[PDB]
Ligand SMILES: *Cc1c(COP(=O)(O)O)cnc(C)c1O
C-alpha cells in the first residue's frame with residue numbers, strides 16, 4: 001500500500017496484523033476464503049464515489065454510462081455462470097439478498113418454512129432475534145436423527161400442515177447435497193414459492209459439483225463471498241417473470257445507492273469463476289473435504305451425516321466428551337481456526353454446542369491438497385485427544401507452522 | 406492498478422473510463438464527493454476476507470483481534486468527531502442505518518412523522534415504494550410555501566394530531582439549517598423518540614458548521630459518504646441507553662457479517678475529518694455554496710428558500726419556463742452534472758420536476774474556490790438561458806473544459 005501507511009499508521013498497523021494473521025493460521029471456518037488481488041483492486045477503485053440508484057440504462061442520476069457497463073458485466077457473467085434468466089447484483093450482503101426476496105413475496109406475518117436453525121438453517125431463515133423471525137411466521141423442517149439428512153417427508157408434512165407462502169431450502173451448515181427437485185415438488189403441492197439460499201455452496205454450483213437450484217427455484221439468493229470466492233456482498237437470481245419485482249424490492253424497496261466498486265469486484269470474481277481453473281479449484285475443495293472427513297474418521301472422530309458431499313463437515317464431539325466451545329478454544333491456541341456449531345438434536349445450547357464446523361475452501365485456495373488434509377486431521381486428533389497436555393499443543397503449533405510456512 | 410488490468414480487461418477499461426469521467430466533468434450532484442487514496446486502499450484490503458459477526462471483543466468467530474482494533478478505531482473516532490456516547494459503524498448504507506433504528510423503536514404499522522418527500526425528505530422517510538412506507542404509517546410535515554423553511558408549527562400540529570411514535574428530522578434536499586432543539590421540544594411534547602438523519606450534512610456537523618443533532622436526538626443516522634467524504638456505508642450514533650438495542654438491531658437484527666474493509670475505510674475517513682484541514686475544507690464547501698448561490702441569483706435564477714446555509718442549493722426553474730429534467734439533460738451535454746429535483750409545492754411530478762439540486766462538496770474537494778463558483782454560475786446561466794443554441798452549448802463545453810483542465 002502507498003497512502004494508507006502515511007495517512008493512518010494505526011489503521012495500517014491493524015490491517016498488516018490481519019494480513020499476516022490470514023497467512024499464519026490454518027483457516028477452517030467454512031464460510032471463509034481468500035479473494036484475488038484483482039477483486040481487491042476493483043473494490044479499492046474510484047467507483048465508491050458514484051451514486052447510481054436504479055439499474056443500468058434506467059438510473060436516477062446522469063454520468064452512469066461506465067458503472068452501467070460494470071453492472072451489466074456482473075449480471076451477464078452471473079447469468080452465464082448459473083444459467084439464470086435474471087440477476088440482481090446490488091444486494092449489499094447475503095442477508096439483504098434474502099430480505100429483498102422476503103419483501104417481494106411476503107406480507108407481514110405470512111408463514112415461511114425453512115430448515116431448522118439447529119440442523120443447518122441460517123439466522124435469516126427465521127431466527128426470533130432476526131428480522132425474518134420477527135416479521136414472518138417461520139416453521140421448520142428437520143434432518144433425520146440418525147442419518148442427519150434432510151427428511152423430505154418432514155418437509156412435505158410441515159408444508160401441508162402449515163401451508164407456507166414460501167419454502168426456503170439451503171443452509172449454512174449442512175454437509176450433504178440438497179435435492180432441489182424434491183423441494184420444488186413439495187412447493188408445487190402446497191402452492192408455495194421456493195427460495196434456495198445457496199450462499200455456502202455457490203462456488204460448487206458454479207463449477208458443476210453441486211446440483212444447480214436455478215431450474216427448480218423461483219428465487220435463488222447467495223453471497224458473492226464464500227465458496228464463490230468473491231467480494232463480500234449478495235446477489236439474487238430469478239426467472240424473467242419476477243425480475244421487475246425483485247429489482248424493485250432491492251431498489252427503491254430495501255436499499256439506497258448500490259456499492260458500484262463492490263459490484264465491479266463481483267464481476268471480476270464471476271469472470272474468475274467462469275474460467276477452467278476455478279472448476280479445478282472447486283473440485284479440489286470437495287476432494288479435500290472428502291479426504292479431510294476420511295482422515296478425521298481415521299483419528300476416531302464422528303462426523304454428522306457420516307461424511308460430506310460438499311466443502312464442509314461437522315464433527316460431533318460427544319464421543320470425546322468435548323463441547324464445540326472447548327474444541328474451538330484449544331484449536332485457536334495452536335493456530336487452527338474453526339467455529340463451534342450445534343449439531344442435529346444437540347443436547348447443548350447454541351452458545352456451547354457439541355460440535356465444530358470445518359470447511360476446506362480457504363485452505364484449498366492457498367494450495368493445500370490431500371497430504372495437507374491428512375496432516376490437518378492428524379493435528380486435530382493430537383490436540384482434541386490431549387487437551388490438557390501443553391506438550392501436545394506445542395507440537396501441534398509446530399506442525400501448523402510447518403503447513404503455513 | 407496492477408492485477409486487474411491483466412485479469413479483467415473489460416472491467417478495467419470501464420473503471421478507467423469512470424476514473425477519467427470523474428476528472429473531466431464538473432460534479433454538482435449534492436450527494437457526491439471524492440474519497441482519498443488512503444480510504445480506497447483500506448477498502449481494497451484483505452479485510453474483505455474476514456467474517457466478524459458480533460462486535461469487538463464479543464465476536465461469534467475467533468481470529469478477530471485485529472479487525473476488532475479497526476472497528477474500535479472507527480467507533481472511538483466517530484465518538485470524538487460527533488460527541489456521541491455510542492456509535493455503530495456496521496451499517497452497510499444510510500438506508501440500512503435508518504432501517505435498524507426503525508427496527509429498534511417501531512412495531513409494524515406504527516406512526517412515524519417525517520419531512521414531506523417533495524420538500525426535502527428522503528426515500529427512506531416514508532416513500533410508499535420503500536420499506537419505510539410499506540412497514541410503517543408515515544405522516545409528513547412541510548416547509549412554508551413562500552420561505553421554503555420548515556414550518557415548525559406544522560411539525561408540532563402533525564405530531565399532536567397523529568401522535569407518532571418516532572419523529573424523523575433531516576433531509577436529502579433542504580438548503581437551510583435544521584433546528585434540532587425545536588424537533589426535540591416537539592418530540593418531548595408528544596412523547597415521541599427523535600431520529601435525525603444527518604447523511605447530507607454530516608461533514609458540516611463534524612466541522613462545526615451545522616448545529617450537531619447528537620445532544621438533541623435519541624438516534625442519529627448517517628451515510629459515511631457525502632459531505633463526510635468517507636467510503637460508501639452507514640453509521641448510527643446514539644446515547645448509551647440505546648446502545649445495546651441499536652447494536653442488536655444491526656446484528657443479529659437486520660444484517661449478517663459486516664464489511665470490515667469498509668469499516669477500516671470509515672476509520673480512515675473519520676481520522677481525516679478530525680484533522681484541522683478537514684474543517685478548512687468544510688468551510689470552503691459552505692462558503693462556495695453561498696458564493697455559487699449568489700452568483701446564480703446574479704444570473705437571474707430563483708433559489709428555493711432564497712439561498713443556502715449549507716452545501717446545497719435548489720434552483721426553481723419556473724421563471725425560465727424549464728423543467729428540472731430539461732435542465733439536467735442540457736447541462737449533461739456540456740459536462741455539468743446535476744440532478745432534477747422537485748421543489749416545494751412543485752406543479753410537476755417527481756420524474757419531471759421544476760428544479761435542479763446543486764451541491765459544492767465534490768468541486769470543493771478538487772480545489773475549486775470562489776472564482777470557480779462564479780464561472781460555474783455564469784456557465785449555467787449561458788446554457789439554461791440559451792437551450793436551443795448549439796453555439797452557446799459549445800462555448801459552455803469549452804468553459805467547462807477550462808475549469809477541469
Ligand atoms: C452467509 C449466509 C447468509 C448471509 O450473508 P451475509 O453476507 O453474512 O449477510 C445468508 N444465508 C446463508 C445460507 C449464508 O451462509
Ligand SMILES: *Cc1c(COP(=O)(O)O)cnc(C)c1O
Pocket residue numbers: 255256257258436498499500501503527529575576577602603604605628638
Ligand atoms: C443518502 C441518504 C440516505 C441513504 O443512503 P444510502 O447509502 O444511499 O442507502 C438516507 N438518508 C438521507 C437523508 C440521505 O441523504
